[PDB]
């Protein structure tokens, strides 16, 4: 049948900010993972609950492709059982995740001479995200006892901040494009199968 549109996810011209991470539902298609196997220059390509050697042999009810930009030092947070600013406040994988996480250095696309400030992350939140929770609110964060009433000041902060992607950045501060493939297996008919 027709191939899952991994092309539209991995090769998108524009990627989301991690706080406003993008989800594409994939279903009713053949997932030929050879487009990912034939790439040598991903910085990371790991699967959880399933061997990457089995992807072309398995069937799922749906696949979800989540995509966003973070910085180099944070790529390790896109894994089960991780904590930090991204896993806590921006994008949380469950501990029982079944799927794959791919990232690559995008410094040639996502940095610019005077700095690219287009990509944001959430710096502050009252509590940690649940797995696959998305928070796009811009409510002023109350860091103290005195309420803010939507006015910034002492202990009253805007919750989002720009990554500063300058081409002179160290690898830890360079931009990485991330795709997370979640493999959903419900008590329902499979609509995504590998070519076997």
């Amino acid at each position, epitope marked *: 049948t027709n191939l899952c549109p991994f092309g539209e996810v991995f090769n998108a011209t524009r990627f989301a900010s991690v706080y406003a991470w993008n989800r594409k539902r994939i279903s009713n298609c053949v997932a030929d993972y050879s487009v990912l196997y034939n790439s040598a220059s991903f910085s990371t390509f790991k699967c959880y609950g399933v061997s990457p050697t089995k992807l072309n042999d398995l069937c799922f009810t749906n696949v979800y492709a989540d995509s966003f930009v973070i910085r180099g030092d944070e790529v390790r947070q896109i894994a089960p059982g991780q904590t930090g600013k991204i896993a806590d406040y921006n994008y949380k994988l469950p501990d029982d995740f079944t799927g794959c996480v791919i990232a690559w250095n995008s410094n040639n696309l996502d940095s610019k001479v005077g700095g690219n400030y*287009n990509y944001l992350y959430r710096l502050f939140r009252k509590s940690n995200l649940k797995p696959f929770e998305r928070d796009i609110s811009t409510e002023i964060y109350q860091a103290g006892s005195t309420p803010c009433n939507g006015v910034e000041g002492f202990n009253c902060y*805007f919750p989002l901040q*720009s990554y500063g992607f300058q081409p002179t950045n160290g690898v830890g501060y360079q931009p990485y494009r991330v795709v997370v493939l979640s493999f959903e297996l419900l008590h329902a008919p499979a609509t995504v199968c590998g070519p076997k």
Partner: nanobody, 125 residues
Framework: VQLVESGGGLMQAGGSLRLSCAVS????????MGWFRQAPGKEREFVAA????????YYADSVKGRFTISRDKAKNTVYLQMNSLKYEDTAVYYC????????????????????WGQGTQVTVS
């Protein structure tokens, strides 16, 4: 982005003046606009910053309680309401666009701006 200031001119000490700055081009809603000033023989001085979304303001100690920065999202305009003007306030007033979203509004007092206008002359007597 392109910035064009107007409203400048000659004012009595104690008086009231409103500067305008018309913004055209790709601004970020989470980011900020600022006013800075330069008197002759002196270095650039930060005056005020405002976050485009939310409208929270941050002021230099020298203008706090006297000047107010505001913006109209409809008209893509930032205002500086200059009340209780002093001799000291004489300078070229410049509008600035910051592309960077900073969590701490006070950051805009020192964070390099990306775009600035030609400016408008303000003289106090």
């Amino acid at each position: 982005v392109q910035l064009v200031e107007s409203g400048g001119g000659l004012m009595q000490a104690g008086g009231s003046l409103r500067l305008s700055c018309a913004v055209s081009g790709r601004t970020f809603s989470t980011a900020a606009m600022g006013w800075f000033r330069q008197a002759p023989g002196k270095e650039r001085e930060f005056v005020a910053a405002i976050r485009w979304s939310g409208g929270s303001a941050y002021y230099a100690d020298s203008v706090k309680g006297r000047f107010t920065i505001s913006r109209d999202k409809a008209k893509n305009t930032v205002y500086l309401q200059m009340n209780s003007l002093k001799y000291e306030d004489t300078a070229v007033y410049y509008c600035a666009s910051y592309q960077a979203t900073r969590s701490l509004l006070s950051d805009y007092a020192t964070w390099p701006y990306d775009y600035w206008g030609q400016g408008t002359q303000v003289t106090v007597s």
